[PDB]
Design a protein around this ligand. Structure first.
Ligand SMILES: Cc1cc2nc3c(=O)[nH]c(=O)nc-3n(C[C@H](O)[C@H](O)[C@H](O)COP(=O)(O)O)c2cc1C
Length: 110
């Protein structure tokens, strides 16, 4: 059902994006080559609430699922409310392997 998402590898320095879906590319206006290997915080900007960023950081540290809403920015500077859902992905041994993040732009752009 989920069309905008990325997968990150927390076993690599700074938990970089290793896969971005076409929907994510379309939402954010970036090309794959522009975002593969980067941490997803490039979506954040001036009006992104630091309290919420902290909550994300905590859930990642604790390796648990969370959902937050925060201001993000497309490549051209456009703001949207991202309802962001994060899910840890463990391997067959129960060791953290990836995180999946699903982005939903809850902003009516009519
Ligand atoms: C899988 C995944 C997807 C993420 N997607 C977003 C996102 O869409 N927008 C956003 O602002 N942060 C996103 N983040 C959060 C940032 O990557 C980072 O974890 C957050 O800013 C907290 O860490 P920091 O204080 O080092 O910046 C995502 C994190 C993960 C693991």
């Amino acid at each position: 059902i989920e069309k905008n998402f990325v997968i990150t590898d927390p076993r690599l320095p700074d938990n970089p994006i290793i896969f971005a879906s076409d929907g994510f590319l379309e939402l954010t206006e970036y090309s794959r080559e522009e975002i593969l290997g980067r941490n997803a915080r490039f979506l954040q900007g001036p009006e992104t609430d630091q309290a919420t960023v902290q909550k994300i950081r905590d859930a990642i540290r604790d390796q648990r699922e969370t959902t937050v809403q925060l201001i993000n920015y497309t490549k051209s500077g456009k703001k949207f409310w991202n309802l962001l859902h994060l899910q840890p992905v463990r391997d067959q041994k129960g060791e953290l392997q990836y995180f999946i993040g699903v982005q939903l732009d809850g902003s009516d752009h009519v």
